[PDB]
Amino acid sequence: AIFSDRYKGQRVLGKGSFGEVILCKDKITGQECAVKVISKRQVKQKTDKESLLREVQLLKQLDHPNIMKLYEFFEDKGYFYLVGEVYTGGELFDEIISRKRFSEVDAARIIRQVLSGITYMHKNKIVHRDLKPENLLLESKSKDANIRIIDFGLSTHFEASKKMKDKIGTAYYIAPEVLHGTYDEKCDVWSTGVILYILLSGCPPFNGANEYDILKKVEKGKYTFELPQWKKVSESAKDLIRKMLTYVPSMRISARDALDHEWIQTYTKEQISVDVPSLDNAILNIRQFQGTQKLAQAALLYMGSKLTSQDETKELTAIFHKMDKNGDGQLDRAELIEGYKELMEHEVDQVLDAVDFDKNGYIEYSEFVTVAMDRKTLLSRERLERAFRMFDSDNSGKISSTELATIFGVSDVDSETWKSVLSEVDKNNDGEVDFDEFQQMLLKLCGN
Ligand SMILES: Nc1ncnc2c1c(Cc1cccc3ccccc13)nn2CC1CCNCC1
């Protein structure tokens, strides 16, 4: 059984953990689904194929409304294809940052869903390990929509990449016992407790200027409710957080018992019978937090994309050159289409639209190369601008040096490195950059 016999790719949904996620369609029934493609080359497996096959078969039999449904598994020489249900409501936090009000009740309802899914998976001896906001998808972009946890069980069978683009934000949520090697299902209670802490305060409990600093705080395991905005939170919420963030896992509360907690019982009642002051500073803080995480991620993806497009520009010109038997540097539509296929049609026609509107004759392939690549980088360049604009909440058009330190810290760009690049971009900078200057910094940070 081969993937492509059954499913056609329709559009890309993003990169997730361990590989690329594509919206696909059953060639017969028309059913839409999401497929995660895991490159055996790029991604090492942890276990034997028999363990993987067994766990997959188990996952297919399981069903819970807060757990992503897996439908099917395929393999060829180069890839694993994991087929499941597609959710269209986006990441939980990207929804939360658009709300005007957010109370403990809203936090409780979110966290009861997470604990419910986790409790069910732990019953089946499946551990997540990498539970974080990015793994909480909504069935629709609405405060009322159901949460689906994605990626349960993957970490048991696949080794995580050490590329920073892949691991942004991971440090905040990882259980200390995972850092040290001996872990079990209790690590997912810790990650949920970190998420709960963030929902209620807008700030991670273990925080720091870069990956090492954050991890050092997680390992020490010390955190407080020192911040001002913890005064607006019930002692009951805090009590559950203490139990979920208990250091020694055998002393840490279970997911089952966290569902039973007074706070969950009391605040997830259909009928709101308790006070619901909007946690206004927490929303402002969560927005700052999400914006920063998205801009750091976008920055890394932009630099990644500029390197990829550099190679591909070279390859494409080489390819067209071989095909250019005339040596006149002009090709027809047909030749351009095969050349672009060779690199790895409607995209060729969009390029020719710009290059020769009338299509009177042949195309300067050099002009085609530019447009092809100098457009194809759009999604990363516009996503970068969108993240910058979003981060810039006051519409100042600038990011301060303090904010750059944060953004780059999160991004593992060395402090002295980005300041040197800043100096090259603008000798007379005054501790702030506009979008173009920021983009100039990123180009210089990836050898451009
Ligand atoms: N189910 C989904 N629905 C929509 N988008 C998704 C996913 C999935 C998860 C997924 C898809 C297909 C198969 C799977 C098999 C095992 C585990 C997870 C799988 N990733 N993404 C992409 C978004 C992009 C924005 N950052 C959050 C993730």
XYZ file of C-alpha atoms and ligand atoms in Angstrom:
476
model
C 0.000 0.000 0.000
C 1.501 3.337 -1.076
C 0.484 6.802 0.117
C 0.226 8.467 -3.291
C -2.162 5.781 -4.598
C -4.702 6.884 -1.947
C -4.079 10.564 -1.166
C -3.284 13.698 -3.179
C -1.554 16.674 -1.586
C -3.698 19.805 -1.828
C -1.919 22.500 0.202
C 0.771 22.865 2.878
C -0.434 23.300 6.491
C 2.937 24.088 8.062
C 5.925 22.451 9.642
C 5.243 20.603 12.847
C 7.396 18.412 14.996
C 9.470 15.831 13.075
C 8.431 17.002 9.580
C 6.103 18.719 7.137
C 2.323 18.711 7.440
C 0.226 18.695 4.257
C -3.542 18.904 3.748
C -4.417 15.924 1.565
C -7.540 14.434 0.039
C -8.636 10.825 -0.402
C -8.605 10.206 -4.181
C -11.863 8.267 -3.984
C -14.069 9.635 -1.193
C -12.864 13.254 -1.218
C -12.186 13.148 2.571
C -9.746 15.836 3.665
C -7.026 14.821 6.109
C -3.684 16.075 7.411
C -0.509 14.133 6.696
C 2.783 14.456 8.553
C 5.731 13.411 6.411
C 8.760 12.264 8.433
C 12.023 11.987 6.468
C 13.891 8.844 7.590
C 17.093 10.568 6.456
C 16.545 13.866 8.295
C 14.872 12.158 11.325
C 16.501 9.298 13.263
C 14.202 6.652 14.768
C 14.644 5.725 18.441
C 13.158 2.229 18.373
C 12.724 -0.895 16.212
C 10.088 -0.860 13.474
C 8.050 -3.493 15.316
C 7.573 -1.176 18.304
C 6.647 1.699 16.009
C 4.179 -0.441 14.014
C 2.577 -1.700 17.233
C 2.225 1.749 18.755
C 0.738 3.077 15.504
C -1.792 0.228 15.453
C -2.698 1.107 19.056
C -3.072 4.815 18.236
C -5.508 3.987 15.385
C -7.822 2.180 17.841
C -7.928 5.042 20.348
C -10.543 7.814 20.425
C -10.945 10.900 22.579
C -12.341 14.332 21.709
C -9.222 16.128 23.015
C -6.744 13.873 21.180
C -5.962 14.138 17.476
C -7.345 11.146 15.579
C -4.849 9.039 13.638
C -6.256 7.202 10.624
C -3.369 5.537 8.795
C 0.362 4.943 8.433
C 2.494 4.523 5.271
C 6.198 4.050 4.655
C 8.512 4.114 1.657
C 12.330 3.971 1.392
C 12.681 7.656 2.382
C 9.624 8.600 4.506
C 6.909 7.778 7.030
C 3.475 9.249 6.281
C 1.155 9.596 9.264
C -2.465 10.333 8.257
C -4.924 11.958 10.629
C -7.771 14.347 11.179
C -7.192 17.959 10.120
C -8.109 20.757 12.534
C -8.631 24.235 11.169
C -8.942 26.458 14.283
C -5.208 27.091 14.659
C -3.050 27.050 17.790
C -4.842 27.766 21.072
C -2.650 30.752 22.012
C -3.098 32.515 18.627
C -6.789 32.507 19.502
C -6.345 33.620 23.114
C -4.307 36.695 22.148
C -7.320 38.050 20.192
C -9.646 37.955 23.231
C -10.593 41.120 25.130
C -11.493 39.235 28.336
C -9.987 36.075 29.858
C -10.780 34.730 33.366
C -9.882 31.729 35.552
C -12.986 30.010 34.207
C -11.638 30.286 30.668
C -8.251 28.975 31.889
C -9.924 26.117 33.787
C -11.981 25.017 30.790
C -8.866 24.963 28.577
C -6.874 22.993 31.157
C -9.677 20.508 31.900
C -9.596 19.578 28.179
C -5.865 19.087 28.211
C -6.003 16.969 31.391
C -8.876 14.950 29.975
C -6.921 14.016 26.818
C -3.768 13.363 28.817
C -5.585 11.211 31.372
C -6.956 9.018 28.565
C -3.585 8.619 26.844
C -1.840 7.758 30.132
C -4.417 5.021 30.693
C -3.120 3.570 27.424
C 0.523 4.065 28.541
C 1.217 6.691 25.885
C 3.354 9.641 26.972
C 3.713 12.943 25.088
C 6.890 14.471 26.633
C 6.809 17.534 24.354
C 3.480 19.008 25.435
C 3.461 22.746 24.689
C 1.000 25.400 23.374
C 1.982 24.729 19.746
C 0.596 21.182 20.224
C -2.834 22.415 21.241
C -4.927 22.933 18.126
C -8.516 24.157 17.970
C -11.258 22.559 15.819
C -12.262 26.166 15.062
C -10.769 29.624 15.814
C -13.222 30.315 18.620
C -13.089 30.439 22.406
C -15.870 27.781 22.382
C -14.055 25.253 20.116
C -12.657 21.899 21.278
C -8.908 21.487 21.889
C -7.063 18.636 20.195
C -3.654 17.617 21.450
C -1.274 16.725 18.620
C 1.941 14.633 18.679
C 1.201 12.171 21.533
C 3.545 9.188 21.356
C 5.921 10.546 18.659
C 8.857 11.303 21.008
C 9.015 7.672 22.061
C 9.965 6.656 18.469
C 11.674 9.674 16.817
C 14.688 11.746 17.888
C 14.127 15.489 18.166
C 16.144 17.841 15.928
C 18.701 20.215 17.455
C 17.958 22.979 14.929
C 16.715 26.075 16.778
C 13.878 26.684 14.273
C 12.392 23.337 15.417
C 12.648 23.848 19.186
C 11.472 27.427 19.878
C 9.709 27.619 23.175
C 10.451 23.980 23.986
C 12.571 24.878 27.041
C 9.702 26.505 28.950
C 7.563 23.362 29.153
C 9.976 20.422 29.455
C 9.977 18.505 32.759
C 13.259 18.568 34.705
C 13.384 14.759 34.868
C 13.279 14.697 31.048
C 16.497 16.809 31.005
C 18.161 14.179 33.223
C 16.907 11.071 31.342
C 14.550 9.163 33.681
C 10.963 10.111 32.869
C 7.468 8.650 32.710
C 3.945 9.971 32.125
C 4.239 12.479 35.038
C 6.320 14.740 32.754
C 3.062 15.613 30.908
C 1.501 16.842 34.141
C 4.516 19.161 34.583
C 4.187 20.604 31.065
C 0.444 21.133 31.622
C 1.226 22.922 34.909
C 3.610 25.250 33.063
C 0.911 25.994 30.502
C -1.609 26.641 33.291
C 0.794 29.041 34.995
C 1.155 30.959 31.701
C -2.635 31.150 31.107
C -3.128 32.717 34.533
C -0.150 35.110 34.613
C 0.983 35.508 30.976
C 4.564 34.725 31.993
C 6.439 31.445 32.004
C 7.299 30.145 35.511
C 10.800 29.201 34.343
C 12.115 32.043 32.243
C 15.438 33.268 30.932
C 17.338 35.121 28.218
C 18.194 32.057 26.057
C 17.708 28.299 25.983
C 20.415 27.498 28.559
C 19.139 30.047 31.062
C 15.583 28.732 30.871
C 16.683 25.080 31.194
C 18.877 25.959 34.186
C 15.791 27.390 35.918
C 13.688 24.330 35.037
C 16.385 22.011 36.383
C 16.565 23.946 39.682
C 12.763 23.681 39.674
C 12.154 26.855 41.704
C 9.353 29.243 40.755
C 7.089 31.746 42.556
C 3.778 33.572 42.410
C 5.729 36.831 43.123
C 4.308 38.744 40.138
C 1.560 41.365 40.789
C -1.026 39.669 38.608
C -1.051 36.570 40.912
C -3.078 38.615 43.442
C -6.091 38.366 41.085
C -5.857 34.535 41.127
C -7.521 32.123 43.548
C -5.409 30.224 46.072
C -7.105 27.132 44.625
C -5.619 27.630 41.098
C -2.216 28.135 42.757
C -2.608 24.970 44.856
C -3.143 22.865 41.669
C -0.134 24.525 40.053
C 1.989 23.544 43.082
C 0.874 19.963 42.748
C 1.429 19.841 38.966
C 4.872 21.520 39.296
C 6.018 19.245 42.156
C 9.630 18.372 41.452
C 9.902 14.670 42.223
C 7.562 12.917 39.789
C 6.301 10.258 42.253
C 5.183 13.151 44.491
C 3.669 14.986 41.520
C -0.090 14.701 41.120
C -1.466 12.480 38.335
C -3.446 13.759 35.361
C -6.467 11.791 36.713
C -6.256 13.452 40.127
C -5.655 16.888 38.594
C -9.040 16.531 36.794
C -10.559 15.853 40.240
C -8.987 18.999 41.720
C -11.271 21.493 43.534
C -10.195 24.254 41.069
C -11.168 22.218 38.006
C -14.458 21.060 39.585
C -15.342 24.587 40.711
C -14.268 26.654 37.658
C -15.422 24.372 34.769
C -19.078 24.283 35.786
C -21.296 25.034 32.738
C -23.059 27.577 34.966
C -20.595 30.291 36.027
C -21.388 30.713 39.735
C -18.065 32.321 40.726
C -16.407 35.742 40.212
C -14.796 36.208 36.803
C -12.593 39.323 36.808
C -10.793 39.578 33.459
C -7.104 38.808 33.940
C -6.121 41.895 32.000
C -2.365 41.965 32.702
C -2.106 38.224 31.913
C -3.693 38.818 28.470
C -1.299 41.692 27.792
C 1.560 39.435 28.944
C 0.425 36.422 26.976
C 0.192 38.655 23.851
C 3.753 39.875 24.459
C 4.791 36.266 24.990
C 3.095 34.884 21.889
C 4.285 37.813 19.768
C 7.877 37.309 20.856
C 7.813 33.536 20.296
C 6.245 34.028 16.832
C 8.716 36.723 15.790
C 11.758 34.662 16.913
C 10.329 31.624 15.024
C 9.586 33.766 11.952
C 13.123 35.226 12.079
C 14.741 31.753 12.039
C 12.433 30.609 9.241
C 13.292 33.712 7.178
C 17.035 33.066 7.508
C 16.471 29.368 6.704
C 14.461 30.346 3.627
C 17.080 32.784 2.339
C 19.750 30.041 2.491
C 17.455 27.521 0.733
C 16.561 30.043 -2.024
C 20.264 30.792 -2.598
C 21.021 27.150 -3.395
C 17.887 26.780 -5.500
C 18.731 29.927 -7.524
C 22.110 28.339 -8.414
C 20.631 24.913 -9.256
C 17.859 26.402 -11.428
C 20.269 28.492 -13.517
C 22.506 25.399 -13.944
C 19.523 23.324 -15.063
C 18.284 25.923 -17.600
C 21.888 26.353 -18.765
C 22.201 22.596 -19.620
C 18.855 22.795 -21.466
C 20.090 25.929 -23.313
C 21.657 24.105 -26.262
C 21.354 27.287 -28.379
C 23.222 29.287 -25.752
C 20.863 32.219 -26.457
C 19.500 32.261 -22.885
C 15.864 31.975 -24.000
C 13.503 29.009 -23.416
C 9.807 28.342 -24.051
C 7.104 27.630 -21.466
C 7.563 23.874 -21.958
C 11.293 23.961 -21.264
C 10.822 26.206 -18.182
C 8.232 23.764 -16.754
C 10.534 20.729 -17.078
C 13.427 22.754 -15.632
C 11.418 23.601 -12.495
C 10.312 19.947 -12.151
C 13.975 18.939 -12.598
C 14.962 21.207 -9.674
C 12.974 19.081 -7.184
C 3.347 24.813 -13.994
C 0.673 27.194 -12.711
C 3.618 28.774 -10.889
C 5.476 29.044 -14.244
C 2.388 30.765 -15.713
C 2.311 33.258 -12.799
C 5.989 34.002 -13.478
C 5.471 34.427 -17.261
C 2.514 36.741 -16.419
C 5.135 39.120 -14.986
C 7.956 38.307 -17.468
C 6.066 38.465 -20.825
C 2.371 39.320 -20.468
C 1.607 38.800 -24.192
C 3.651 35.537 -24.436
C 4.841 36.605 -27.897
C 7.814 34.271 -27.839
C 10.641 32.914 -25.724
C 11.575 33.785 -22.169
C 14.915 35.005 -20.874
C 15.363 32.137 -18.400
C 17.588 34.388 -16.216
C 14.650 36.765 -15.740
C 12.534 33.683 -14.954
C 14.926 32.469 -12.274
C 14.703 35.799 -10.430
C 10.893 35.969 -10.495
C 10.476 32.269 -9.597
C 12.706 32.511 -6.503
C 12.301 36.240 -5.780
C 8.571 35.498 -5.440
C 8.637 31.986 -3.864
C 10.281 33.447 -0.724
C 7.140 35.585 -0.247
C 5.459 33.389 2.404
C 8.521 33.660 4.713
C 9.154 37.419 3.951
C 5.520 38.410 4.489
C 5.176 36.094 7.452
C 8.227 37.852 8.882
C 6.626 41.284 8.370
C 3.339 40.058 9.802
C 5.153 38.791 12.941
C 7.040 42.080 13.286
C 3.788 44.079 12.952
C 2.075 41.814 15.482
C 4.956 42.102 17.991
C 4.791 45.902 17.509
C 1.599 46.267 19.591
C 1.754 50.078 19.889
C 2.356 50.528 16.131
C 5.620 52.397 16.814
C 7.247 50.809 13.747
C 10.308 49.985 15.846
C 11.751 47.314 18.111
C 13.962 48.452 21.020
C 17.388 47.006 21.807
C 15.915 45.356 24.909
C 13.295 43.635 22.710
C 15.988 42.574 20.238
C 17.930 40.998 23.161
C 14.837 38.960 24.005
C 13.954 38.054 20.450
C 17.512 36.967 19.654
C 17.983 35.197 22.983
C 14.926 33.062 22.290
C 16.435 32.566 18.790
C 19.946 31.540 20.049
C 21.567 34.371 18.139
C 24.613 35.314 20.116
C 24.349 38.736 21.838
C 27.686 40.121 20.621
C 26.951 38.698 17.155
C 23.647 40.549 16.512
C 25.003 43.847 17.904
C 27.973 43.657 15.529
C 25.570 43.120 12.617
C 23.411 46.022 13.876
C 26.472 48.255 13.881
C 27.206 47.276 10.236
C 23.594 47.953 9.186
C 23.353 51.361 10.899
C 26.372 53.039 12.508
C 24.039 55.695 13.999
C 21.382 53.368 15.415
C 19.904 54.622 18.664
C 18.979 51.295 20.250
C 16.011 50.583 17.965
C 15.350 49.228 14.486
C 12.506 49.489 11.966
C 11.358 46.465 9.976
C 13.827 46.887 7.088
C 16.763 47.256 9.491
C 15.630 44.126 11.321
C 15.401 42.266 7.982
C 18.876 43.605 7.149
C 20.188 42.170 10.425
C 18.683 38.756 9.646
C 20.288 38.773 6.161
C 23.670 39.472 7.711
C 23.109 36.741 10.322
C 22.821 34.115 7.574
C 25.864 35.097 5.496
C 24.177 37.726 3.310
N -3.843 17.635 12.679
C -3.457 18.805 12.195
N -4.390 19.608 11.665
C -4.038 20.797 11.158
N -2.776 21.219 11.143
C -1.802 20.478 11.698
C -2.120 19.246 12.240
C -0.881 18.748 12.680
C -0.545 17.444 13.372
C -0.560 16.181 12.516
C -1.023 16.247 11.207
C -1.046 15.091 10.417
C -0.615 13.890 10.937
C -0.139 13.815 12.236
C 0.297 12.588 12.749
C 0.777 12.499 14.051
C 0.818 13.644 14.850
C 0.376 14.860 14.325
C -0.110 14.953 13.018
N 0.048 19.661 12.407
N -0.477 20.636 11.867
C 0.311 21.788 11.453
C 0.219 22.955 12.474
C 0.994 24.187 11.957
C 0.961 25.322 13.010
N 1.634 24.821 14.227
C 0.830 23.729 14.831
C 0.795 22.541 13.852
